[PDB]
Amino acid sequence: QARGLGTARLQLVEFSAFVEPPDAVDSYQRHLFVHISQHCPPLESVDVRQIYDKFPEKKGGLRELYDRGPPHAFFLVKFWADLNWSGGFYGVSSQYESLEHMTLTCSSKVCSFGKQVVEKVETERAQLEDGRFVYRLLRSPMCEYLVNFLHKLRQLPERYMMNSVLENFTILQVVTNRDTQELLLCTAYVFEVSTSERGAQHHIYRLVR
């Protein structure tokens, strides 16, 4: 059914992860590691069992989440990350959109070899705008674990080694209705590096079973 990253209950308007150099205050610029923009065909599909072992087990892992359902809320995003941009500002921004008013709880578990490593949980109630509610989680500071990992990754001598290391690094995003606990949107991210002649790129799949 789906054609973008979203459902009828909750659509992703924009997601990005970025850095602003210390110079940004005199002349502005930001460098986008990854960027989904859904302002203005069916998506490809990837069978969720094939990536079970890339996200935690027991509880809050991919197999029980999909088992809770609803199935249509699950997506996979391959990112090609741009790491060609010292002490600046590193941040993540997300905007979701619904027809109805809720409080959103957003967790993002970072995983390495399938073991949760860091997790951040942020909450966000709706702001009624043009006949629909919008949820704005803009400029969340990246946790120092990610920023350090970026600084280490950016230093390796070959792209293939960056991709090798990234083969074991994933991020899982679970958006739930805070009041009712129902799953609205669940999003697995897997990462390569882009040959930064090309900046960031992505490909969204639905996760089916």
Side-chain angles (χ1 to χ4, degrees), residues 37-57 60-130:
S37 182
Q38 299 197 118
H39 328 74
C40 334
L43 277 186
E44 282 186 58
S45 42
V46 166
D47 169 284
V48 51
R49 317 193 203 103
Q50 265 293 0
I51 79 168
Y52 277 163
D53 52 348
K54 295 186 117 320
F55 300 87
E57 283 289 348
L62 199 33
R63 163 148 24 185
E64 330 290 11
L65 279 175
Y66 201 101
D67 217 45
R68 303 179 24 198
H72 74 278
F74 292 86
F75 300 88
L76 170 57
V77 179
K78 324 192 186 220
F79 278 136
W80 288 268
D82 182 356
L83 326 176
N84 287 273
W85 77 97
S86 318
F89 169 78
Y90 293 66
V92 172
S93 291
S94 325
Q95 307 174 231
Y96 306 86
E97 215 170 85
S98 182
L99 287 148
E100 82 185 320
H101 177 92
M102 20 186 69
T103 295
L104 292 190
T105 280
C106 314
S107 57
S108 322
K109 329 205 223 305
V110 173
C111 304
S112 161
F113 310 91
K115 300 316 179 74
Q116 173 173 146
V117 171
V118 200
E119 181 184 7
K120 157 150 219 186
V121 192
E122 257 152 1
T123 206
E124 172 65 49
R125 65 201 262 102
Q127 305 106 286
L128 187 295
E129 289 189 6
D130 269 307

Side-chain angles (χ1 to χ4, degrees), residues 10-16 39 93-97 104 129 134-138:
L10 196 71
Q11 306 94 51
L12 179 92
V13 166
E14 230 201 307
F15 157 87
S16 81
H39 328 74
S93 291
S94 325
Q95 307 174 231
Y96 306 86
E97 215 170 85
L104 292 190
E129 289 189 6
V134 317
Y135 311 76
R136 279 195 192 93
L137 316 90
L138 288 291

